[PDB]
Design a protein around this motif. Structure first.
Motif, PDB file in Angstrom:
ATOM      1  N   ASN A  63      -3.649  -2.059   2.540  1.00  0.00           N
ATOM      2  CA  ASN A  63      -3.094  -2.966   3.526  1.00  0.00           C
ATOM      3  C   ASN A  63      -4.087  -4.054   3.845  1.00  0.00           C
ATOM      4  OD1 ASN A  63      -0.550  -1.661   3.919  1.00  0.00           O
ATOM      5  ND2 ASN A  63      -1.410  -0.276   5.450  1.00  0.00           N
ATOM      6  N   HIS A  64      -3.636  -5.302   3.860  1.00  0.00           N
ATOM      7  CA  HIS A  64      -4.538  -6.402   4.192  1.00  0.00           C
ATOM      8  C   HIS A  64      -3.956  -7.160   5.366  1.00  0.00           C
ATOM      9  CE1 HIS A  64      -6.105 -10.586   3.549  1.00  0.00           C
ATOM     10  NE2 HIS A  64      -7.196  -9.906   3.911  1.00  0.00           N
ATOM     11  N   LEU A  65      -4.659  -7.093   6.516  1.00  0.00           N
ATOM     12  CA  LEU A  65      -4.334  -7.697   7.821  1.00  0.00           C
ATOM     13  C   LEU A  65      -2.964  -7.193   8.355  1.00  0.00           C
ATOM     14  CD1 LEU A  65      -5.782 -11.255   7.136  1.00  0.00           C
ATOM     15  CD2 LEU A  65      -6.789  -9.540   8.654  1.00  0.00           C
TER      16      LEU A  65
ATOM     17  N   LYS B  58      -1.082 -14.348   6.400  1.00  0.00           N
ATOM     18  CA  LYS B  58      -1.850 -14.121   5.155  1.00  0.00           C
ATOM     19  C   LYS B  58      -2.032 -12.581   4.869  1.00  0.00           C
ATOM     20  CE  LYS B  58      -5.948 -15.853   7.688  1.00  0.00           C
ATOM     21  NZ  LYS B  58      -6.750 -17.089   7.903  1.00  0.00           N
ATOM     22  N   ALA B  59      -1.206 -11.773   5.527  1.00  0.00           N
ATOM     23  CA  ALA B  59      -1.204 -10.334   5.410  1.00  0.00           C
ATOM     24  C   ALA B  59      -0.273  -9.850   4.300  1.00  0.00           C
ATOM     25  CB  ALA B  59      -0.784  -9.730   6.738  1.00  0.00           C
ATOM     26  N   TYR B  60      -0.501  -8.611   3.822  1.00  0.00           N
ATOM     27  CA  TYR B  60       0.331  -7.979   2.790  1.00  0.00           C
ATOM     28  C   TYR B  60       0.205  -6.468   2.787  1.00  0.00           C
ATOM     29  CZ  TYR B  60      -3.878  -7.870  -0.340  1.00  0.00           C
ATOM     30  OH  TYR B  60      -5.115  -7.648  -0.909  1.00  0.00           O
ATOM     31  N   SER B  61       1.181  -5.794   2.178  1.00  0.00           N
ATOM     32  CA  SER B  61       1.152  -4.345   2.072  1.00  0.00           C
ATOM     33  C   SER B  61       1.299  -3.975   0.635  1.00  0.00           C
ATOM     34  CB  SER B  61       2.243  -3.707   2.920  1.00  0.00           C
ATOM     35  OG  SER B  61       2.068  -2.299   2.927  1.00  0.00           O
TER      36      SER B  61
ATOM     37  N   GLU C 211       8.312   1.608   6.838  1.00  0.00           N
ATOM     38  CA  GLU C 211       6.939   1.309   7.215  1.00  0.00           C
ATOM     39  C   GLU C 211       6.940   0.467   8.499  1.00  0.00           C
ATOM     40  OE1 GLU C 211       4.538   2.873   5.330  1.00  0.00           O
ATOM     41  OE2 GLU C 211       2.825   2.063   6.456  1.00  0.00           O
ATOM     42  N   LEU C 212       7.743  -0.637   8.543  1.00  0.00           N
ATOM     43  CA  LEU C 212       7.848  -1.519   9.710  1.00  0.00           C
ATOM     44  C   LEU C 212       8.492  -0.820  10.916  1.00  0.00           C
ATOM     45  CD1 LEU C 212       8.889  -4.779   7.788  1.00  0.00           C
ATOM     46  CD2 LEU C 212       6.748  -4.546   9.030  1.00  0.00           C
TER      47      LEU C 212
ATOM     48  N   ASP D  11      -3.194 -14.511  11.210  1.00  0.00           N
ATOM     49  CA  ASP D  11      -3.558 -13.423  10.295  1.00  0.00           C
ATOM     50  C   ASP D  11      -2.318 -12.755   9.714  1.00  0.00           C
ATOM     51  OD1 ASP D  11      -6.352 -13.587  10.135  1.00  0.00           O
ATOM     52  OD2 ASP D  11      -6.738 -11.850  11.430  1.00  0.00           O
TER      53      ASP D  11
ATOM     54  N   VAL E 221       5.483   0.514  12.996  1.00  0.00           N
ATOM     55  CA  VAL E 221       4.637  -0.626  13.356  1.00  0.00           C
ATOM     56  C   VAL E 221       5.305  -1.322  14.539  1.00  0.00           C
ATOM     57  CG1 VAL E 221       3.492  -2.737  12.509  1.00  0.00           C
ATOM     58  CG2 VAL E 221       3.887  -0.846  10.924  1.00  0.00           C
ATOM     59  N   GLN E 222       4.546  -1.578  15.617  1.00  0.00           N
ATOM     60  CA  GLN E 222       5.064  -2.192  16.852  1.00  0.00           C
ATOM     61  C   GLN E 222       5.530  -3.631  16.656  1.00  0.00           C
ATOM     62  OE1 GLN E 222       1.917  -0.950  16.496  1.00  0.00           O
ATOM     63  NE2 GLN E 222       1.340   0.370  18.236  1.00  0.00           N
TER      64      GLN E 222
ATOM     65  N   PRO F  91       4.620  -8.962   5.971  1.00  0.00           N
ATOM     66  CA  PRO F  91       5.757  -8.132   6.431  1.00  0.00           C
ATOM     67  C   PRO F  91       6.233  -8.440   7.855  1.00  0.00           C
ATOM     68  CG  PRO F  91       3.983  -6.769   5.474  1.00  0.00           C
ATOM     69  CD  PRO F  91       3.420  -8.138   5.696  1.00  0.00           C
ATOM     70  N   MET F  92       5.265  -8.671   8.756  1.00  0.00           N
ATOM     71  CA  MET F  92       5.452  -8.948  10.183  1.00  0.00           C
ATOM     72  C   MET F  92       6.145 -10.288  10.460  1.00  0.00           C
ATOM     73  SD  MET F  92       4.534  -6.248  11.667  1.00  0.00           S
ATOM     74  CE  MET F  92       3.857  -6.453  13.283  1.00  0.00           C
TER      75      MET F  92
ATOM     76  N   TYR G 171       3.789   6.266  15.397  1.00  0.00           N
ATOM     77  CA  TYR G 171       2.880   5.258  14.858  1.00  0.00           C
ATOM     78  C   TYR G 171       1.741   5.925  14.088  1.00  0.00           C
ATOM     79  CZ  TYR G 171       5.353   2.228  18.203  1.00  0.00           C
ATOM     80  OH  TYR G 171       6.314   1.540  18.902  1.00  0.00           O
TER      81      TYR G 171
END
Lengths: 322, 312
Positions: free
Chosen positions: A49-51, B39-42, B23-24, B36, B27-28, B67-68, A3
């Motif tokens: 990165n946003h949120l 409305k998120a982005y990478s 990338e994912l 949130d 990420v857990q 992404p999530m 991570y």
């Protein structure tokens, strides 16, 4: 699974960065041979990165890889695999060695140094000549084995880093450490540095502590001939203020420190610990030595000595202390 | 894999899907999506200089929306991320003959990539929370489009938006007859130009004039119209309209024969035993991102449902 988490956001970016670049190179063909454009090449990446992934990583960072093709080839000529290199620098965060910050990869195989924009400029100007030197000597050198060079940017903080192969064993602990230059002048560790767990002792400390290096006549010759070849190359490049780092592993001191808590004591893989030299059978105490040239990026341009003077004074000093 | 293509936008899409799925994997997997995450982005910007000029453009941008959420939707649709990544990266997506609404299909004909507008992207965010909650509620069993990723590409001052959906059609069994049905009271007919193509998209009037029959057994017909009713009512509630039922017919005789994996070809329905023709049908709702804002959705949904029930 990884991570790339750290208290230090610079280490998080460095870990993501090495992972990113090593993966990127698995989608780039191995060239027949490196071309002059590779020696002025780079890759820049800006992440915003946003949120997303706010817990593990900083949201806004940059990462620049200098000459990616040259460093992948340098890695290969030093017998390092890209996947191994990646794991060593990402499986777990690198630890600080407590300005010019030094970090060791969690498996004690690689060293990460925070360098200046001048060092990065100096690294670029010596890169063609350095690469050809590593080709002509089949990777058999006392010189630093540079394996990657990056620019990091997080929270408005810009740092440059260079990854090298450790001088010291990934497995065997070092009880005594010397930084040797010789010549000019009162080079000695302070009472403050002397108070540390593993102090960086210097020239006068090597003489006054009555330090000896018990290697056989053959290794001594093989070493001093290798040192002259590398130190001659250094003077051609007009480099100086470089030193010979000396680390001593004490076998029977390492045994007693591990009795408190398929390789025999005093044995090491020279394919991993490339700078290792066994003591000779007539040594008063079974030791292992790790010696290499360190800190080479100080150019002459930027009373005092010139690189020819520096090279002779240095070789004379090592040859007299054996 | 070098994500090479004559089209630099396909090179970026291939690079981005590869980057995004790796990338994912760093990420857990969360226990639950939060507002949130919706409305998120990478965003990623690449500026290469004298590095990988033979395979990729030197200056490009890639943006992944939520992404999530899209990773979770994939899991809910029984799609493994590595398989998804491999299907969109191993070999370039091929354009469907085709600066209009471009269509690409993954090299293994599993996924579909549609070039959308920023309005559609805004329209997807507006419905993402209710969409995701609807998919959770129907345990993934729906005739609605399976949204699996939504990205924004930038190379040579060109800026396009893409959306990845599951193919309605079979990744192996070919389609010989294809319809785009709405059930609208207006002459919906295929042009002579369209009717000329290898596989034309026939419309409402063509279905009736050709006296087309969809022979699906009573149990499967019940199950289908049930899903359809719930999905169309969900759409009407979102004020969405102008959507279509896409019908793909596979002629079994014109070729295991009429066999398919319902885990891969999820919209596949085996025809009646007594059917005069051995056929396989691929039916689903497509092109849903049109708000009433820009006949009302309540009327549109009835007029649609009535017609599908009418043609069975």
């Amino acid at each position: 699974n990884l991570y790339f988490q750290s208290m230090d956001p610079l280490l998080s970016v460095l870990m993501w960065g090495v992972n990113h670049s090593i993966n990127e190179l698995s989608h780039v063909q191995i060239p027949v041979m490196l071309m002059p454009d590779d020696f002025k090449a780079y890759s820049k990446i800006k992440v915003d990165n946003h949120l997303f992934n706010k817990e593990n990583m900083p949201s806004h960072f940059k990462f620049k890889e200098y000459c990616p093709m040259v460093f992948r080839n340098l890695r290969e000529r030093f017998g390092i695999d890209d996947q191994d290199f990646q794991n060593s620098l990402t499986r777990s965060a690198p630890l600080p060695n407590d300005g010019a910050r030094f970090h060791t990869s969690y498996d004690k195989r690689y060293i990460i140094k925070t360098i200046t924009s001048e060092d990065v400029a100096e690294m670029h100007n010596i890169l063609k000549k350095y690469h050809q030197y590593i080709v002509e000597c089949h990777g058999i050198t006392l010189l630093p084995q540079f394996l990657g060079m990056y620019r990091l940017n997080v929270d408005g903080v810009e740092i440059y880093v260079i990854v090298t192969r450790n001088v010291f064993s990934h497995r065997l602990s070092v009880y005594r450490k010397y930084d040797l230059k010789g010549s000019t002048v009162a080079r000695e560790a302070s009472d403050k540095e002397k108070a540390k767990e593993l102090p960086t002792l210097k020239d006068n400390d090597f003489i006054n502590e009555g330090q000896k290096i018990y290697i056989d006549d053959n290794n001594k010759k093989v070493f001093l001939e290798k040192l002259k070849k590398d130190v001659e190359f250094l003077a051609q490049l007009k480099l100086m203020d470089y030193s010979l780092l000396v680390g001593i592993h004490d076998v029977e001191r390492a045994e007693q420190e591990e009795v408190e808590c398929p390789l025999a004591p005093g044995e090491f893989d020279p394919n991993i610990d490339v700078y290792g030299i066994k003591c000779h059978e007539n040594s008063p105490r079974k030791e292992v030595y790790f010696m290499a040239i360190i800190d080479i990026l100080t150019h002459y341009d930027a009373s005092t000595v010139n690189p020819e003077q520096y090279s002779k004074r240095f070789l004379d000093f090592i040859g007299h202390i054996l």
